[PDB]
Structure formats: structure tokens, C-alpha cells
């Protein structure tokens, strides 16, 4: 079927910079003909070529094209002028999840449950297509205008074909031990991350903290962390079935028999998994 015109820079009115990266910048832009707002990621071809990132830029584009779910930032289009690449991304009006965590300290039982259920839901979809995020964190979990989550940042993801290959290491506090002792990663890697996130929603801080990265990696492989007193019991329990050094024993992985058991965990008792994105999120305390 024929497609709409290939878009070009002039079709937009660029506005504020939302965020600046090492090899890119996200700029909020407004499309002239439609008046729609898109968050446009811009990258300089020369810089990318100079830094051997073609693999990372191509992957991000490819992975996102394949995605088609309400909990993932959509990639509306792409185009390029002589020196730059533009990626039309959906604009999450309420920003990073982390913002909220800092704004209110920790989440209460209901808000933790709800949002954790979306992450899980989103992870089940992703893994369903044999895709590993590899750097999941509150910074990558955005919130749309309705306060529903929207995972983004897939340039460092990985597509499976065998648990497989390797490359980089995501943010320190979310790295699973297998990456520190095996230089290899699988789906559970995202599960370990999930465990960390859940723990952070409840305690206000991630499981492994230390003066530097080398120190956090030291705690990770030794599994050094502990729960705070008021930590919701069922939540605590779920987290213990997630932060397991052995990646084949994490609740939710293939060897553990998938997402059935995970969604069936007591912590999600009252969750209705079927239409999460059509439910009204609990007001963030
Ligand atoms: C308000 N906000 C939304 C951002 C958005 C996105 C974004 C957000 N991140 C990660 C968090 C950046 N702080 C990205 C990483 C790679 C590519 C895009 C993003 C996005 O995909 N849509 C957005 O609306 C964003 C990015 C950087 C800084 C602030 C941001």
C-alpha cells in the first residue's frame, strides 16, 4: 500500500531539548500540517560512523519498528537530511518514572502493584518477540499523559535467535550478575532488573548502592542487599524470587516456565492482567 510523503525537517517547528545524549539529542517538535507533538531523536551520521555505532542505531530502529503495544514508545517515522538522522518518537508527556519516585519517596502497595504489573505485562510482550531490553530502569520507563508506562531506549537491546551473545553493560545498579561473571545475557537479565525496580518503588532506593561502580558490582555478585522493615511482605517475597544469582531460577524465565507463574504470584492477587492500559492508574501518593 502507498505510504504518506517522506517527511523532512521543514515539516516541523522544533522546540525545547528534552534530553541530551552522548550520540544523540531528543527534541520536542510539532508537526506543521497536523499540529501533533512528537519527541524527535536526532543523531549525526558522522559522529555515529566515527564512533562505530551503526549497529546500535540500526538495531534501535529495527527493534522499535517491530514493537506494537501500548506500553512501548512508538516510532512513527524516520528521515534524514545530509548530516542528520531523525526518529519520530511518541512523546511521553509525564516523563521518566524515576521523577515520580524522587518526588514522593516510595510507592505505597497499590501504586507499586499497578505499575509493576505494567512493567511485567510489557516485559512479557517484549520477550514474546525474543527481545531483551538489556538496560531497563526507571529512567527508561516513561509515563504518558494518562500516567500509563511507556518503555523506551532500545538501541542497546538484543534480538535472540538460539540466552545468547553479548556487548555492553547497562546502568550499574541494574546489571545482573551473569553480565559480570559471564559476559553473556538472556531474558532473565531483564527480570533481575525488574526485581531491582520493584525494590526501588517500595524502598525509594535501588537494592545495590555503593561509592562507585566497582563496588556495586562487588555487591551484586555476592548478592549483598537487605530489605527495610516496612517492606510489603508479598512484595519482598516476589523480589526474593527475582534477585536470584542463578538466572535459571528467576520467577518468569523459561526454565521457570514463563510468565504464568510470575503473574500468578500472590503480590498480584487483585491484578486484572487483560486490560491494564485501559484501567485508571492509582493516584501517585
Ligand atoms: C521527558 N522526556 C521524554 C523523553 C522521551 C523519550 C526518550 C527517553 N529516553 C530515556 C530517558 C531520558 N531521560 C530515551 C532514550 C532513547 C530514545 C528516546 C528516549 C522517548 O522515546 N520519548 C520521549 O518523550 C525524553 C528523553 C530524554 C529526556 C527527557 C525525556
Amino acid at each position: 500500500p502507498p505510504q504518506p510523503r517522506k517527511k523532512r525537517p521543514e515539516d516541523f517547528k522544533f522546540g525545547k531539548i528534552l534530553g541530551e545524549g552522548s550520540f544523540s539529542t531528543v527534541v520536542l517538535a510539532r508537526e506543521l500540517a497536523t499540529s501533533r507533538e512528537y519527541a524527535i531523536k536526532i543523531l549525526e551520521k558522522r559522529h555515529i560512523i566515527k564512533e562505530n555505532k551503526v549497529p546500535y542505531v540500526t538495531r534501535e530502529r529495527d527493534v522499535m519498528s517491530r514493537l506494537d503495544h501500548p506500553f512501548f514508545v512508538k516510532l512513527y517515522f524516520t528521515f534524514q537530511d545530509d548530516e542528520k538522522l531523525y526518529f519520530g518518537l511518541s512523546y511521553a508527556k509525564n516523563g521518566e518514572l524515576l521523577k515520580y519516585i524522587r518526588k514522593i519517596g516510595s510507592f505505597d502497595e497499590t501504586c507499586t502493584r499497578f505499575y509493576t504489573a505494567e512493567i511485567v505485562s510489557a516485559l512479557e510482550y517484549l520477550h514474546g518477540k525474543g527481545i531483551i531490553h538489556r538496560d531497563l530502569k526507571p529512567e527508561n520507563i516513561l509515563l504518558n499523559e494518562d500516567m500509563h508506562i511507556q518503555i523506551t531506549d532500545f538501541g542497546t537491546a538484543k534480538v535472540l535467535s538460539p540466552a545468547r551473545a553479548n556487548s555492553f553493560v547497562g546502568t550499574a545498579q541494574y546489571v545482573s550478575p551473569e553480565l559480570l561473571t559471564e559476559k553473556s545475557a538472556c531474558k532473565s537479565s531483564d527480570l533481575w532488573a525488574l526485581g531491582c525496580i520493584i525494590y526501588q518503588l517500595v524502598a525509594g532506593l535501588p537494592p545495590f548502592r555503593a561509592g562507585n561502580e566497582y563496588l556495586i558490582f562487588q555487591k551484586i555478585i555476592k548478592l549483598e542487599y537487605d530489605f527495610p522493615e516496612k517492606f510489603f511482605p508479598k512484595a519482598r517475597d516476589l523480589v526474593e524470587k527475582l534477585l536470584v544469582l542463578d538466572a535459571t531460577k528467576r520467577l518468569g524465565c523459561e526454565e521457570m516456565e514463563g510468565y504464568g507463574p510470575l503473574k500468578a504470584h500472590p503480590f498480584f492477587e487483585s491484578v486484572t492482567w487483560e486490560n491494564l492500559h485501559q484501567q485508571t492508574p492509582p493516584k501517585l501518593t
Side-chain angles (χ1 to χ4, degrees), residues 1-163 165-229 231-273 275-282 284-285:
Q3 293 170 50
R5 346 290 87 174
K6 197 62 175 181
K7 307 184 186 299
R8 56 187 183 82
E10 303 75 12
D11 299 319
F12 296 98
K13 182 184 178 186
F14 292 85
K16 66 172 181 173
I17 296 182
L18 290 178
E20 293 165 289
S22 330
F23 320 80
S24 54
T25 310
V26 183
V27 181
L28 175 58
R30 181 177 295 286
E31 176 172 47
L32 293 177
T34 72
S35 190
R36 282 157 168 157
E37 307 191 79
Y38 297 99
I40 295 183
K41 181 169 177 171
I42 304 170
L43 317 78
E44 177 191 55
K45 280 168 277 173
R46 184 178 256 178
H47 188 190
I48 298 177
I49 294 172
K50 278 210 206 296
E51 305 302 334
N52 285 65
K53 301 300 187 185
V54 188
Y56 289 105
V57 181
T58 294
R59 184 182 314 144
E60 171 172 47
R61 177 181 175 163
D62 295 9
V63 166
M64 294 193 102
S65 278
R66 288 184 165 69
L67 300 183
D68 186 15
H69 186 296
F71 292 156
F72 289 101
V73 178
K74 193 185 197 317
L75 186 189
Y76 289 92
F77 52 73
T78 67
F79 62 80
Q80 62 165 284
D81 53 24
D82 296 304
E83 9 272 318
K84 297 172 169 177
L85 288 208
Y86 304 73
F87 289 4
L89 301 182
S90 70
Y91 169 44
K93 291 187 176 59
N94 295 312
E96 294 150 61
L97 172 54
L98 180 56
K99 184 187 80 166
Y100 292 92
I101 295 177
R102 299 198 187 312
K103 193 198 301 291
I104 78 161
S106 59
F107 280 31
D108 62 41
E109 176 111 57
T110 299
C111 291
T112 297
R113 196 196 306 102
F114 182 80
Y115 281 102
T116 289
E118 301 210 322
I119 293 169
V120 170
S121 176
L123 294 187
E124 164 183 48
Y125 173 78
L126 188 65
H127 294 169
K129 318 182 81 61
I131 296 171
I132 299 172
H133 186 279
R134 272 211 291 159
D135 188 35
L136 185 66
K137 45 180 171 172
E139 194 187 1
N140 284 326
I141 309 169
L142 319 199
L143 286 144
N144 75 356
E145 170 190 63
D146 300 305
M147 286 310 271
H148 279 281
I149 71 173
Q150 281 195 288
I151 300 179
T152 178
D153 182 50
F154 301 79
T156 61
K158 189 66 183 176
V159 174
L160 285 170
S161 189
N166 169 251
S167 262
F168 92 136
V169 189
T171 309
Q173 20 270 300
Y174 303 100
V175 176
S176 62
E178 56 258 36
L179 281 75
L180 298 173
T181 64
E182 277 179 43
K183 196 176 202 299
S184 59
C186 55
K187 297 175 191 178
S188 287
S189 298
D190 295 339
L191 292 195
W192 173 283
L194 173 68
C196 299
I197 296 179
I198 294 163
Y199 178 105
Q200 191 182 329
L201 288 177
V202 188
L205 299 181
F208 309 108
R209 302 154 289 167
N212 52 60
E213 281 174 52
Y214 169 81
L215 280 175
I216 309 171
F217 293 155
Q218 191 147 44
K219 282 163 167 168
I220 290 174
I221 68 177
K222 298 182 83 171
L223 192 72
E224 185 169 53
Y225 81 98
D226 24 280
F227 301 88
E229 251 294 36
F231 204 114
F232 319 125
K234 295 179 183 175
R236 168 177 170 141
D237 178 288
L238 171 65
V239 166
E240 301 182 318
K241 294 193 203 292
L242 282 178
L243 302 176
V244 178
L245 292 183
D246 186 343
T248 61
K249 305 298 199 310
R250 290 163 195 170
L251 184 53
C253 74
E254 299 149 310
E255 297 66 34
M256 282 312 271
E257 311 296 318
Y259 288 78
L262 177 54
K263 298 169 68 174
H265 181 293
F267 183 66
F268 303 120
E269 200 123 38
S270 64
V271 173
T272 299
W273 300 93
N275 65 319
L276 282 169
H277 90 121
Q278 293 172 315
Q279 299 188 23
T280 281
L284 274 174
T285 61

